[PDB]
Amino acid sequence: MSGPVPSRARVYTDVNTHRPREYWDYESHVVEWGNQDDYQLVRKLGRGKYSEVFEAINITNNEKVVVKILKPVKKKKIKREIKILENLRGGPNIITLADIVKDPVSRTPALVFEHVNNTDFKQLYQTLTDYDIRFYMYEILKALDYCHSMGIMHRDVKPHNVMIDHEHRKLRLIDWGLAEFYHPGQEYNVRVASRYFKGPELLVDYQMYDYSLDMWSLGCMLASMIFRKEPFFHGHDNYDQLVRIAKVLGTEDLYDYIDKYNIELDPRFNDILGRHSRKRWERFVHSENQHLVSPEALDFLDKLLRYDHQSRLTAREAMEHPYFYTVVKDQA
Ligand SMILES: O=c1oc2c(O)c(O)cc3c(=O)oc4c(O)c(O)cc1c4c23
């Protein structure tokens, strides 16, 4: 009946605003295509959605690389990823776009990324130590703070998008194919991110979201890691996703969130959330995960997983949490 209350990023609100138009205007951006023959496809890695990736080698200098060929997708979408990748290139822990080559495989070309010898995310989880997790979480935070400071929301933060070469302690945040430029007052598509990592704002159709979305997804990751339940919030659909969350954060804070921003609750919700108390994080601590848990980790996770997007810690203040006190601190 009314309408929802507007919202804006609590930090880096207008980093794109006064930057040259070329920076964020990706649909008019045109690319100087690299050469397809410079790379030799060696093996097909994994199995990608609307895109297939391969292990490969640059013929001109035998450097190992990963070629990502794009499938039947709209131009402006390819441009968006390319433009975002080029802009963030050089930033801490951001995957480096080594090249973009033209190839008539389906009206779509290919993206060349630096090679990351990452351990199968599924087996790696099970071998990390308390320090490894604090270290890696810190590295991801560096990537988010930098990208957010460069005006980009990743929108698909999850274990599958964090390549980790554990032997080299090298970490890269990948798949910027859903990333978007933040503009205050803008209403974005709530599709983005994987179900299990979607912030409440996406689940209740709140379109004026921001960088803080990535912080919720990061929280879901953290939770799955320290508690060893991957994923932590496992819902069946958007509606069930929020229910899984409420069974932990409670329903009261959820109801307070929707009222604060005057959110139109869909018929499918009024009776599905029910009534749940706020559960304590210590409840999920058992003999299989206690070594990756600590009071600061719990306090940290608690400041990340908040219904209200504006209340969640920003990447930078997350890096200032005691949870990361032990982590290196050499700043270089
Ligand atoms: O930069 C990437 O490196 C990768 C890999 O090294 C890999 O082994 C598998 C993948 C993969 O499955 O999907 C990807 C994406 O959708 C994407 O946008 C970027 C990358 C990968 C990727």
From Swiss-Prot:
- The residues listed in the UniProt record as binding ATP, with positions renumbered to this chain, are 45-53, 68
List, in alphabetical order, the Gene Ontology terms for molecular function in this entry.
ATP binding; Hsp90 protein binding; identical protein binding; kinase activity; protein serine kinase activity; protein serine/threonine kinase activity
**Recorded coiled-coil stretches:** none
In which tissues has expression of this protein been reported?
Expressed in gastric carcinoma tissue and the expression gradually increases with the progression of the carcinoma (at protein level).
Keywords from the named record = Apoptosis, ATP-binding, Biological rhythms, Cell cycle, Disease variant, Intellectual disability, Kinase, Nucleotide-binding, Nucleus, Phosphoprotein, Serine/threonine-protein kinase, Transcription, Transcription regulation, Transferase, Wnt signaling pathway
UniProt-listed GO biological process terms: apoptotic process; chaperone-mediated protein folding; DNA damage response; double-strand break repair; negative regulation of apoptotic signaling pathway; negative regulation of double-strand break repair via homologous recombination; negative regulation of proteasomal ubiquitin-dependent protein catabolic process; negative regulation of signal transduction by p53 class mediator
Top-level EC class as recorded in UniProt: transferase
Q: Where in the cell is it found?
A: Nucleus
Processing and modification events after translation: Phosphorylation does not directly affect casein kinase 2 activity, but may contribute to its regulation by forming binding sites for interacting proteins and/or targeting it to different compartments.
According to the record, the protein's activity is controlled as follows: Constitutively active protein kinase whose activity is not directly affected by phosphorylation. Seems to be regulated by level of expression and localization.
Q: What is its EC number?
A: 2.7.11.1
Ranges for region Interaction with beta subunit: 36-41
**Reactions catalysed:** L-seryl-[protein] + ATP = O-phospho-L-seryl-[protein] + ADP + H(+); L-threonyl-[protein] + ATP = O-phospho-L-threonyl-[protein] + ADP + H(+)
Q: Which residues form the active site?
A: 156
Q: Where is the Protein kinase domain?
A: 39-324
Assembly with partners or alone: Heterotetramer composed of two catalytic subunits (alpha chain and/or alpha' chain) and two regulatory subunits (beta chains). The tetramer can exist as a combination of 2 alpha/2 beta, 2 alpha'/2 beta or 1 alpha/1 alpha'/2 beta subunits. Also part of a CK2-SPT16-SSRP1 complex composed of SSRP1, SUPT16H, CSNK2A1, CSNK2A2 and CSNK2B, which forms following UV irradiation. Interacts with RNPS1. Interacts with SNAI1. Interacts with PML (isoform PML-12). Interacts with CCAR2. Interacts with HIRIP3.
Additional facts recorded: Can use both ATP and GTP as phosphoryl donors. Phosphorylation by casein kinase 2 has been estimated to represent up to one quarter of the eukaryotic phosphoproteome. Casein kinase 2 has been found to be increased at protein level and up-regulated at the level of enzyme activity in the majority of cancers. However, elevated levels of casein kinase 2 are present in certain normal organs such as brain and testes.
Q: What does this protein do?
A: Catalytic subunit of a constitutively active serine/threonine-protein kinase complex that phosphorylates a large number of substrates containing acidic residues C-terminal to the phosphorylated serine or threonine. Regulates numerous cellular processes, such as cell cycle progression, apoptosis and transcription, as well as viral infection. May act as a regulatory node which integrates and coordinates numerous signals leading to an appropriate cellular response.
Family from the record = Belongs to the protein kinase superfamily. Ser/Thr protein kinase family. CK2 subfamily.
Please state the pathology the record ties to this protein: Okur-Chung neurodevelopmental syndrome: An autosomal dominant neurodevelopmental disorder characterized by developmental delay, intellectual disability, behavioral problems, hypotonia, speech problems, microcephaly, pachygyria and variable dysmorphic features.
Protein name, entry field:
Casein kinase II subunit alpha
Q: Which organism is this protein's natural source?
A: Homo sapiens
Which gene is annotated as encoding this protein in its UniProt record? CSNK2A1
**Shown residues within the full chain:** 1 to 332 of 391
